[PDB]
Amino acid sequence: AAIVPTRELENVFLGRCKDYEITRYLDILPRVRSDCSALWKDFFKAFSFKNPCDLDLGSYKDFFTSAQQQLPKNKVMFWSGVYDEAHDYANTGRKYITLEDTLPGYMLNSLVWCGQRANPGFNEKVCPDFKTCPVQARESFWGMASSSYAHSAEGEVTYMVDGSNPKVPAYRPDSFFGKYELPNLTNKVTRVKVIVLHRLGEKIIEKCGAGSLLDLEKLVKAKHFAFDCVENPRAVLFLLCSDNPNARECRLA
Amino acid sequence: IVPTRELENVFLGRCKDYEITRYLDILPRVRSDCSALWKDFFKAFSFKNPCDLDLGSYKDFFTSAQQQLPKNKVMFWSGVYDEAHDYANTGRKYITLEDTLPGYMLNSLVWCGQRANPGFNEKVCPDFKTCPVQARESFWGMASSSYAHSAEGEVTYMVDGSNPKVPAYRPDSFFGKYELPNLTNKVTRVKVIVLHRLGEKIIEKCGAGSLLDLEKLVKAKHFAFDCVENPRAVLFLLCSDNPNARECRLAK
Ligand SMILES: *[C@H]1O[C@H](COP(=O)(O)OP(=O)(O)OC[C@H]2O[C@@H](n3cnc4c(N)ncnc43)[C@H](O)[C@@H]2O)[C@@H](O)[C@@H]1F
Ligand SMILES: *[C@H]1O[C@H](COP(=O)(O)OP(=O)(O)OC[C@H]2O[C@@H](n3cnc4c(N)ncnc43)[C@H](O)[C@@H]2O)[C@@H](O)[C@@H]1F
């Protein structure tokens, strides 16, 4: 297997940018000042005309300064290990915002790209496996996306975690949330609200107030943020149950 | 009503995004490129009074834009836009019009023909409560017909059973006018899902009122028919947004 770059990278980027600019999230997120051409130039210069592993956490800095929107107070959501559940519950911006609803998360979501030295300065044929590149190159785009997103969060933030993974603690200093988001929360954040997912029909592994969740509680306390934690709150349980209505946890009476 | 800015840039942007990245495993790519689809779409209403359109204006657009639809997956709805879309879940459970290339590119857009250059008005539109019916329903009517005509196997129809003023099924809805009569023999069954909104009085029921009207219409069309009121998967989805509603009670 070989990793396949996105085709027509620039067309896809400028199409999604233009689509978002004029039509998406209009009453939920603000427009940025840069036009789509200027955004493309700052994104392209981060990686182009260089070897595909020759990136670092500064490479997209200009792109993110251009692309970063102010985010709605109390609405920012973070997640680890529970992508679909967290996005279903955030509900496309209606209840919470995720990185994928913001301009840069939306334009680059699912895309694959890499630089090369030879013209045209990016590789249309193949990209290396991220594991062959140093971590600061591998994490250069989504690590900067994550720090910049977390740095803009104000008021209460909400963090959804996996509480049924016997091998991956619900909270980990090594996840993108623990590397790039929690430590870049500013003093404009007042509270971290944790939602522990207990996946239906599976063994419960982590619980509020114990283990990594307790380590997280104390970390948050020390940043002078308030903290709360809930396991399968009803609003979330109902979503899980809609997809698996026979599960025991969804029984009626 | 205010038209969408940069109509062509928006249309061509969503077209490109769709083509390269959207529904790649669920729906096929159409043959025409984005610039040919734009020509078709534009000529449908360009350089014509914003109200001189008929059920045939967008015929060639829809013909270039039509995709074959996954069998058993098509979803229709009347009066429950949000619930129907949330249940279909962006192509993961069912397909709606808005997941297809044409529904996706034009969803929520507003656009107006005008006679004078440049063929379309970028500042104002006819509040289409003004227009003749056939010019009003002209885009989404052809969309609905072309979509419904691409449907295969079982189809699903979600309705509101809690509206005292609007029947669950109406022959004058887009479903009644344009979808149900455009179902070909490749369709074999119509499955109705009656929504009973939380906290509201039950108005409509399977096997009565406008739903019995419908069942006899479906059975006469040589399709199978079934019907269910708040099946659990739909119920639980409604409960997520209103979890204290009496209907949403769970085991002690
Ligand atoms: C900022 O960062 C965290 C998200 O990353 P974490 O490392 O905290 O969480 P984790 O789930 O451990 O890693 C992300 C995984 O999700 C998958 N994924 C990324 N992008 C997608 C899309 N677009 N669709 C489906 N799955 C996706 C990756 O493959 C990773 O394994 C959040 O709080 C903020 F975004
Ligand atoms: C094709 O038709 C139905 C939805 O239309 P109905 O008339 O059956 O349903 P109702 O909820 O009573 O009317 C809503 C109207 O909105 C217009 N419309 C259809 N599709 C769109 C999109 N995508 N965006 C904006 N407006 C739309 C129509 O005038 C509807 O009548 C579904 O089974 C299929 F969509």
Side-chain angles (χ1 to χ4, degrees), chain A, chain B residues 1-251:
Chain A
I3 309 266
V4 184
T6 295
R7 296 176 291 126
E8 299 186 32
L9 180 62
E10 177 174 3
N11 293 332
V12 171
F13 179 107
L14 288 175
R16 283 178 173 193
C17 183
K18 177 62 59 175
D19 180 20
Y20 187 109
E21 174 191 277
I22 305 301
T23 84
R24 307 298 180 162
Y25 297 104
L26 290 170
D27 44 344
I28 303 192
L29 289 160
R31 300 305 87 183
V32 297
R33 305 173 194 108
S34 303
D35 77 4
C36 290
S37 291
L39 291 158
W40 172 261
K41 298 267 167 273
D42 281 341
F43 171 70
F44 192 63
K45 84 184 187 179
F47 60 92
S48 51
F49 293 104
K50 287 184 298 162
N51 284 328
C53 295
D54 184 27
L55 287 180
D56 62 34
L57 187 65
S59 303
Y60 295 94
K61 176 161 320 130
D62 280 4
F63 173 65
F64 282 95
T65 296
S66 293
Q68 191 58 60
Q69 292 155 294
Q70 299 304 296
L71 303 179
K73 184 194 206 192
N74 310 316
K75 285 224 269 160
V76 166
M77 168 168 281
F78 294 113
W79 50 274
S80 299
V82 298
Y83 185 101
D84 290 346
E85 291 85 355
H87 290 83
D88 186 31
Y89 186 54
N91 199 193
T92 318
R94 296 172 107 132
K95 187 159 193 128
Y96 300 96
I97 287 309
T98 66
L99 180 51
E100 290 74 29
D101 301 310
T102 68
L103 173 61
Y106 178 102
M107 286 191 298
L108 288 309
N109 173 90
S110 296
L111 307 199
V112 175
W113 68 93
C114 56
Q116 60 183 42
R117 307 222 87 216
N119 301 311
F122 69 108
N123 198 321
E124 295 176 288
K125 158 69 170 150
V126 65
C127 286
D129 182 303
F130 71 112
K131 311 189 323 267
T132 62
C133 294
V135 62
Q136 76 284 353
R138 158 198 328 165
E139 290 181 1
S140 160
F141 181 79
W142 289 109
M144 188 67 246
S146 307
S147 319
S148 186
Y149 174 77
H151 182 90
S152 305
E154 313 188 25
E156 293 175 338
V157 300
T158 299
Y159 179 34
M160 195 187 285
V161 292
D162 197 344
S164 309
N165 189 317
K167 298 204 179 154
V168 184
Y171 164 78
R172 274 187 300 139
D174 33 296
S175 62
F176 294 168
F177 179 79
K179 289 189 290 180
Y180 299 118
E181 312 175 331
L182 179 60
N184 286 305
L185 298 177
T186 66
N187 69 19
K188 297 182 161 180
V189 163
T190 46
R191 188 183 288 275
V192 184
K193 298 176 75 62
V194 185
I195 298 177
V196 175
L197 175 64
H198 287 153
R199 299 174 175 282
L200 302 189
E202 323 238 272
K203 218 186 162 237
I204 296 170
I205 309 299
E206 300 235 47
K207 275 198 76 67
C208 292
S212 75
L213 291 157
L214 173 68
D215 304 336
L216 188 64
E217 174 160 7
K218 295 171 175 149
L219 278 178
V220 167
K221 280 315 212 132
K223 297 189 75 86
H224 329 273
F225 305 145
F227 175 89
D228 50 64
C229 187
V230 67
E231 314 186 355
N232 278 11
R234 299 250 146 186
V236 168
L237 169 69
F238 285 115
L239 299 175
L240 309 177
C241 284
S242 179
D243 283 322
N244 182 183
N246 294 324
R248 148 75 47 156
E249 305 84 337
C250 306
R251 236 84 117 1
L252 275 26
Chain B
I1 196 172
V2 172
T4 303
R5 284 173 304 116
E6 315 192 20
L7 182 66
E8 185 182 349
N9 288 342
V10 168
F11 172 115
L12 286 174
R14 288 174 159 198
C15 190
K16 182 63 48 171
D17 181 27
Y18 192 105
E19 169 200 8
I20 310 295
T21 74
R22 300 298 179 173
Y23 307 98
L24 289 167
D25 298 333
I26 292 314
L27 286 165
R29 315 297 91 187
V30 109
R31 258 165 77 84
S32 311
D33 63 37
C34 284
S35 72
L37 295 160
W38 164 262
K39 278 183 205 184
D40 271 339
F41 172 67
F42 195 54
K43 84 180 155 171
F45 60 97
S46 61
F47 302 105
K48 319 149 70 147
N49 291 309
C51 202
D52 189 70
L53 292 163
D54 59 32
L55 178 61
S57 307
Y58 296 97
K59 193 51 190 289
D60 288 351
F61 171 62
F62 279 103
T63 293
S64 317
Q66 200 44 59
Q67 302 159 284
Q68 327 147 264
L69 305 179
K71 180 174 155 143
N72 306 309
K73 301 308 173 164
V74 164
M75 167 70 82
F76 295 109
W77 47 277
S78 300
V80 298
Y81 185 94
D82 281 336
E83 291 88 359
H85 290 80
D86 296 329
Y87 189 48
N89 191 198
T90 310
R92 296 199 155 98
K93 186 167 191 142
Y94 288 97
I95 288 316
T96 75
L97 220 198
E98 292 67 43
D99 298 311
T100 74
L101 168 68
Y104 183 98
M105 286 186 301
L106 283 319
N107 194 210
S108 296
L109 306 191
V110 192
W111 68 95
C112 331
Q114 76 186 18
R115 275 159 155 202
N117 308 287
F120 69 117
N121 181 354
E122 309 198 84
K123 282 95 185 72
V124 26
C125 239
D127 159 44
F128 270 63
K129 184 182 101 278
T130 250
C131 270
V133 65
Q134 64 291 344
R136 180 174 36 237
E137 296 180 336
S138 172
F139 176 85
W140 295 104
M142 186 70 232
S144 301
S145 311
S146 175
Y147 176 65
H149 172 95
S150 282
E152 290 192 63
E154 292 179 328
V155 298
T156 295
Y157 184 35
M158 186 180 310
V159 302
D160 181 348
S162 306
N163 190 323
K165 284 175 225 268
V166 178
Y169 161 82
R170 293 189 286 118
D172 62 325
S173 63
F174 284 13
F175 182 78
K177 270 185 84 176
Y178 298 121
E179 305 172 335
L180 174 59
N182 281 308
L183 295 179
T184 79
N185 75 5
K186 310 212 96 219
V187 164
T188 49
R189 176 182 294 268
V190 182
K191 300 188 71 68
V192 172
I193 289 165
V194 181
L195 207 145
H196 290 151
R197 299 173 185 282
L198 292 181
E200 301 194 11
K201 150 177 194 250
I202 287 169
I203 307 297
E204 302 234 39
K205 256 151 150 17
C206 294
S210 78
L211 296 151
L212 180 65
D213 292 338
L214 169 69
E215 157 165 21
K216 285 162 167 167
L217 221 216
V218 167
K219 292 178 176 182
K221 281 262 266 138
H222 321 283
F223 302 127
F225 177 80
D226 57 62
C227 185
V228 282
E229 332 180 327
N230 284 10
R232 295 174 303 150
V234 181
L235 179 63
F236 292 148
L237 173 55
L238 306 177
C239 295
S240 180
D241 293 318
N242 183 10
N244 290 316
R246 185 179 304 234
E247 306 94 317
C248 290
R249 266 131 53 68
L250 300 169

